[PDB]
């Protein structure tokens, strides 16, 4: 089997968070079902009704050191915006990549990103980047290129 985990977008900040459980559902005549969500990092007081189609998706993947090759200009990624008073995962697009030789610490590559929600830009290391699961495809392709 292959497990499928989810992340959901909060209406409080527009950031994405891991989902620990789905507790309930509600339906509308107009469409767009909603699901009651318990967040992995938080408790019952932070439970939220979430638009299933628009604000729930398969969990983004924290990148392995070698997986930097699967992060391309033009990609949507989930990027850790770390600041003064808060540090949250926000959708961003990769504008450019500065790819450097890896060492003992792993990936030395750097990525210029632009956050979707505020158009702000930042240079980030791989450790702040989560790639969408479909990019696994890319990796698989690369894996097929290896020697038998």
């Amino acid at each position: 089997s292959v497990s499928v985990e989810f992340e959901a977008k909060s209406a409080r900040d527009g950031a994405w968070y891991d989902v620990a459980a789905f507790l309930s559902h509600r339906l509308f005549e107009s469409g767009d079902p909603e699901v009651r969500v318990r967040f992995s990092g938080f408790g019952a007081e932070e439970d939220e009704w979430i638009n299933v189609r628009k604000c729930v998706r398969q969990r983004s993947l924290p990148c392995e050191a070698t997986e930097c090759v699967a992060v391309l200009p033009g990609d949507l990624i989930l990027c850790f915006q770390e600041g003064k008073d808060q540090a949250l995962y926000y959708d961003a697009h990769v504008l450019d990549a500065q790819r450097r030789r890896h060492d003992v610490g792993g990936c030395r590559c750097r990525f210029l990103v632009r956050y979707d929600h505020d158009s702000s830009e930042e240079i980030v290391p791989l450790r702040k980047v989560c790639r969408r699961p479909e990019t696994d495809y890319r990796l698989q392709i690369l894996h097929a290129a290896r020697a038998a």
């Binding site: 409080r12 900040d13 950031a15 968070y17 891991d18 990092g41 993947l61 924290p62 850790f80 808060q86 540090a87 949250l88 995962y89 450790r127 702040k128 989560c130």
Partner: peptide, 8 residues
Amino acid sequence: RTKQTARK
């Protein structure tokens, strides 16, 4: 695969 801890 572990994410960093979000702080609100």
